Amino acid sequence: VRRCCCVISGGVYENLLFFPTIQLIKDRYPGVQVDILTTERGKQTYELNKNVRWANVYDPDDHWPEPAEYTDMIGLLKGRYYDMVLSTKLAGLGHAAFLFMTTARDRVSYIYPNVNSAGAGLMLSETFTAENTNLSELGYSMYTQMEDWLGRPFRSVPRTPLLPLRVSISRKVKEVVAAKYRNAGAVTGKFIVIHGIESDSKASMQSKGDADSLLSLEKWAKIIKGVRGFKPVFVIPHEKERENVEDFVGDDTSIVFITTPGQLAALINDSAGVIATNTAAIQLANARDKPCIGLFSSEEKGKLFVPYAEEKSNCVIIASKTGKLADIDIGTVKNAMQVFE
Amino acid sequence: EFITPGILFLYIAGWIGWVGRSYLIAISGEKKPAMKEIIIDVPLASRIIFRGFIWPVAAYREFLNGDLIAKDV
Amino acid sequence: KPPPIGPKRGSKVKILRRESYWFKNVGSVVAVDQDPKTRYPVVVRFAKVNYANISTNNYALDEVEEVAA
Amino acid sequence: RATWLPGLNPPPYLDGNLAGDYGFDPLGLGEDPESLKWYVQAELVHSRFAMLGVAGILFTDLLRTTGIRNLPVWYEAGAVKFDFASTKTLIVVQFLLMGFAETKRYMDFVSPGSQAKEGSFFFGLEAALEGLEPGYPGGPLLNPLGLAKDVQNAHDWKLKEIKNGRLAMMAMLGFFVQASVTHTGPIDNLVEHLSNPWHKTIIQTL
Amino acid sequence: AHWMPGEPRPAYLDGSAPGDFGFDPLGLGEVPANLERYKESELIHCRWAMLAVPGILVPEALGYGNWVTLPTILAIEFLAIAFVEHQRSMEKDPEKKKYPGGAFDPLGYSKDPKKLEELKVKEIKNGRLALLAFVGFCVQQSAYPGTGPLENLATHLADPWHNNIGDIVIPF
Amino acid sequence: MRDLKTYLSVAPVLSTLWFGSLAGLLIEINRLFPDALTFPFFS
Ligand code: CLA
Numbered sequence: 001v002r003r004c005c006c007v008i009s010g011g012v013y014e015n016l017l018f019f020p021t022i023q024l025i026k027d028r029y030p031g032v033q034v035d036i037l038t039t040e041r042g043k044q045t046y047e048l049n050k051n052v053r054w055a056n057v058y059d060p061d062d063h064w065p066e067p068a069e070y071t072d073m074i075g076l077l078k079g080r081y082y083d084m085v086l087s088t089k090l091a092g093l094g095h096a097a098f099l100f101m102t103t104a105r106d107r108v109s110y111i112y113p114n115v116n117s118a119g120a121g122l123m124l125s126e127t128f129t130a131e132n133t134n135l136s137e138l139g140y141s142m143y144t145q146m147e148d149w150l151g152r153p154f155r156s157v158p159r160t161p162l163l164p165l166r167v168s169i170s171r172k173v174k175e176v177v178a179a180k181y182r183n184a185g186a187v188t189g190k191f192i193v194i195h196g197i198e199s200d201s202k203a204s205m206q207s208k209g210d211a212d213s214l215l216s217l218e219k220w221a222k223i224i225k226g227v228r229g230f231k232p233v234f235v236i237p238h239e240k241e242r243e244n245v246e247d248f249v250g251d252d253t254s255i256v257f258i259t260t261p262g263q264l265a266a267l268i269n270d271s272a273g274v275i276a277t278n279t280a281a282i283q284l285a286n287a288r289d290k291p292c293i294g295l296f297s298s299e300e301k302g303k304l305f306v307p308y309a310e311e312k313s314n315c316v317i318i319a320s321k322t323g324k325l326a327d328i329d330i331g332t333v334k335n336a337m338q339v340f341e
Numbered sequence: 342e343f344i345t346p347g348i349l350f351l352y353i354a355g356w357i358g359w360v361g362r363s364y365l366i367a368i369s370g371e372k373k374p375a376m377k378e379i380i381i382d383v384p385l386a387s388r389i390i391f392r393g394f395i396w397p398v399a400a401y402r403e404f405l406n407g408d409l410i411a412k413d414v
Numbered sequence: 415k416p417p418p419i420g421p422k423r424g425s426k427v428k429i430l431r432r433e434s435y436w437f438k439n440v441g442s443v444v445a446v447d448q449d450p451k452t453r454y455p456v457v458v459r460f461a462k463v464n465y466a467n468i469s470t471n472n473y474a475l476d477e478v479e480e481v482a483a
Numbered sequence: 484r485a486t487w488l489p490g491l492n493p494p495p496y497l498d499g500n501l502a503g504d505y506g507f508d509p510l511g512l513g514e515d516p517e518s519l520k521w522y523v524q525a526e527l528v529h530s531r532f533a534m535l536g537v538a539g540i541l542f543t544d545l546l547r548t549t550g551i552r553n554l555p556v557w558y559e560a561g562a563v564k565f566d567f568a569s570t571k572t573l574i575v576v577q578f579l580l581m582g583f584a585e586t587k588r589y590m591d592f593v594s595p596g597s598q599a600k601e602g603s604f605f606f607g608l609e610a611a612l613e614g615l616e617p618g619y620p621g622g623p624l625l626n627p628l629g630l631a632k633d634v635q636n637a638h639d640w641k642l643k644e645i646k647n648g649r650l651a652m653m654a655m656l657g658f659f660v661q662a663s664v665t666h667t668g669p670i671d672n673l674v675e676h677l678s679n680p681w682h683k684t685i686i687q688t689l
Numbered sequence: 690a691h692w693m694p695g696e697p698r699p700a701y702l703d704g705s706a707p708g709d710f711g712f713d714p715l716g717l718g719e720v721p722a723n724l725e726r727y728k729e730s731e732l733i734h735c736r737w738a739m740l741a742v743p744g745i746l747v748p749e750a751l752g753y754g755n756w757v758t759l760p761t762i763l764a765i766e767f768l769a770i771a772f773v774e775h776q777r778s779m780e781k782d783p784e785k786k787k788y789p790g791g792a793f794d795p796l797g798y799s800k801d802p803k804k805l806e807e808l809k810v811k812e813i814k815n816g817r818l819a820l821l822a823f824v825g826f827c828v829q830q831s832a833y834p835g836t837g838p839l840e841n842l843a844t845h846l847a848d849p850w851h852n853n854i855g856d857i858v859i860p861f
Numbered sequence: 862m863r864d865l866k867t868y869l870s871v872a873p874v875l876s877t878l879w880f881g882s883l884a885g886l887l888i889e890i891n892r893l894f895p896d897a898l899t900f901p902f903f904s
């Protein structure tokens with residue numbers, strides 16, 4: 001192939017985890033101008049990719065889009081003259097016809113376990129039935145079918161990981177986030193980012209399959225009282241959380257307002273510690289070798305979203321003993337003291 | 342002459358039988374059920390007295406589910 | 415054995431005796447004579463009386479069978 | 484929740500997670516659970532047929548009374564002799580086709596995986612009959628648009644369905660009795676009510 | 690491999706038998722001996738009906754006999770057929786009672802077992818179809834007294850949406 | 862009184878109440894709809 005789309009869905013987190021798949025694609029065929037037809041807040045991840053070409057905004061899960069917009073995007077994908085679709089939108093006919101109207105050589109999608117996925121095999125060269133119908137709930141990997149078929153042993157090795165989630169920031173986002181925490185009282189090497197705050201905001205970057213993923217504030221007040229201050233910067237998803245956090249944990253506690261995942265990875269890259277819950281920030285911390293802890297609401301969910309905690313040897317995983325995101329708040333402080341210094 | 346009033350009969354007759362049967366089953370889980378056959382529990386029956394309106398379907402399901410006819414044990 | 419030999423006190427039991435009034439009817443074991451020489455130890459208490467206005471009778475261990483409920 | 488008359492608790496054998504529950508079962512028909520499942524599928528099919536019926540009656544009578552098309556009265560509509568086909572053939576054709584439909588629906592209700600697995604040939608379409616749910620078959624044949632791809636988390640759509648369908652069934656009983664003691668169409672009875680409402684009701688029929 | 694996909698197949702017929710689709714809703718073939726006798730009688734009824742139907746439509750296409758004395762033709766019939774039927778009754782091997790082979794199987798169709806099974810499936814399918822066709826002949830001659838089967842097919846092909854079964858099945 | 866209603870619910874008192882109500886029903890039907898041998902509605 002030379003031109004390849006991606007009709008990925010979900011938001012920040014699902015499109016973030018697709019970066020080893022894109023690196024797999026460019027590792028498979030030498031020069032590919034990969035495109036992305038994602039939802040909003042999916043484009044914002046694609047500063048961190050150094051591989052791709054357009055990265056539009058479409059919201060593929062709309063299911064009754066604007067017919068002007070729908071016809072325009074069908075014709076746009078026709079005018080870009082692709083060779084491979086790689087949907088992972090998890091839909092069948094109706095959307096298989098959408099991938100079929102693109103003049104594509106290799107129509108690839110995901111397919112429901114249910115019925116809304118019949119008649120799709122007619123219009124797809126790969127079927128790739130998935131699980132749970134809530135595809136982010138499958139965990140970190142989510143694409144082992146698509147990873148194992150893209151690059152089957154036909155001439156050489158698959159090479160299905162290449163040190164998965166190598167995100168990369170540029171100098172411009174580094175300078176603007178440097179100004180954003182330099183407005184706070186942080187030093188460019190010695191601070192700790194969080195990105196876990198109980199909120200009602202779509203900049204939380206969580207998942208589609210996780211519900212109770214974001215930790216509270218008075219629980220967080222206990223966590224931030226139990227921990228020594230290594231300048232913990234606080235990453236709010238919206239400005240209405242600023243005064244709320246300053247009411248709970250204090251006025252001296254620095255708050256950095258970040259809603260962009262590229263800005264969030266730039267804030268990771270200057271940090272020295274990460275106390276993220278199950279958001280994009282765990283994977284961004286595992287990118288560029290930052291020591292994370294990775295809070296979760298379940299040990300099993302933590303294994304599904306981090307299967308590589310034994311590999312990086314810094315992301316010492318902590319979850320809740322029950323479900324419902326209520327952990328011990330003690331031993332996590334202990335190994336936060338252990339690994340961050 | 343016969344068939345429409347025959348259905349009209351059988352509908353009422355099965356009403357009688359079905360409310361009586363559901364009443365006897367209702368009092369069956371009592372300490373001394375016989376006193377409820379003497380002293381008719383009018384609230385219970387009155388809550389059941391209209392439950393025989395739907396006897397041709399409830400009885401059919403109790404026959405399919407196995408609740409119409411008792412088992413020997 | 416000194417431990418109980420028959421059903422438990424309260425175990426609803428069925429009668430396999432063909433000559434009893436409560437044949438193929440359930441009961442309620444109220445006692446079991448643990449003496450290992452009596453022939454009909456199982457003292458049952460039924461809900462409805464017999465023709466002699468009696469609700470209780472002794473039964474054997476082989477003339478009795480507990481239900482799955 | 485609001486269960487069909489305040490002052491009464493809903494029965495404990497039905498509550499919440501069902502299409503428009505509201506706890507109305509005073510006569511203990513959904514007491515047995517499999518009976519309730521059968522009755523749910525019965526209700527859905529009844530309500531959908533009744534909705535098609537109310538549409539096919541109200542639309543035809545809007546065309547008739549106003550005078551757009553010379554269609555017959557719903558009451559006297561069955562004895563229309565069609566040129567290309569006869570009613571004696573149409574009853575048999577309906578029997579065949581709706582048997583292939585309803586027996587398939589049934590064999591899915593008793594065995595959801597059926598009609599799509601093995602030797603279930605319907606012109607090679609053994610995939611659109613996946614079912615996905617009791618009473619909500621889905622698939623490219625049955626929901627081409629797929630407004631509710633999901634069906635467990637589609638409580639608004641199923642609630643709209645069942646409420647509109649209960650109301651359509653009640654309106655069909657209206658069509659049955661209202662036009663057996665008045666011998667006119669529904670729209671005729673409506674405009675009879677909307678001229679003098681306090682002088683043309685059921686009890687104004689002497 | 691099922692007459693109505695979805696119905697639970699009974700335990701006594703599951704696909705192994707040559708013509709098994711699990712159609713025993715009345716439970717006639719519960720016991721094995723009656724089942725074996727039934728499949729024997731089924732094959733025999735099938736073969737007689739498949740002998741019959743080409744002896745109906747072929748006289749009707751050319752001869753138009755409508756498929757409509759006693760004390761000699763009856764005697765010769767009984768003599769010729771009772772001998773064969775009792776000689777058939779004198780076999781005890783059941784798979785040889787259904788499928789004798791030997792002096793009944795020339796041309797070597799029974800030489801390969803997989804094609805033998807497939808051809809047994811073919812026999813039983815065509816035979817059930819022919820039994821249905823003969824019952825159709827009989828009831829179409831009962832409803833329409835003086836018409837032929839191919840005559841009725843012409844009646845259907847003339848105006849199929851007006852000359853069909855419905856005229857007899859409902860009073861109107 | 863609870864015991865008076867317990868007695869009114871007894872089998873003979875409730876039986877005569879039920880059959881008096883029923884008999885009044887059938888009586889008033891055979892006065893309003895007398896001399897009936899055939900059900901003429903949808904006949
Ligand atoms: C068992 C044998 C027998 C039979 C079959 C009859 C039959 C009859 N007798 Mg004779 N009779 C008998 C024994 C018998 N009698 C004996 C033993 C005596 C001496 C005690 C008499 C003395 C006698 C007299 C003196 C008279 C009769 C009369 C009658 C007629 C009564 C019609 C009537 O008013 O009902 C109408 C129906 C009812 C009263 C029942 C109404 C039920 C209610 C309304 C519930 C139904 C509605 C419900 C809600 C369901 C609707 C459907 C929907 C909601 C689901 C009928 C022909 C009378 C007559 O007219 O003779 C011809 C008459 O004058 N009989």
Ligand SMILES: CC1=C(/C=C/C(C)=C/C=C/C(C)=C\C=C\C=C(C)\C=C\C=C(C)\C=C\C2=C(C)CCCC2(C)C)C(C)(C)CCC1
Nearest residue numbers: 343344347354355356357358359360362396397400401409
């Ligand atoms: C049509 C008709 C006729 C005839 C008929 C017949 C012949 C019938 C038969 C029938 C039969 C042969 C039947 C059988 C049955 C059996 C059984 C076995 C049953 C059972 C049942 C039950 C068990 C029920 C119960 C109940 C109910 C539901 C009601 C109430 C309650 C109770 C619980 C009692 C004539 C011509 C004369 C006249 C006209 C009409």
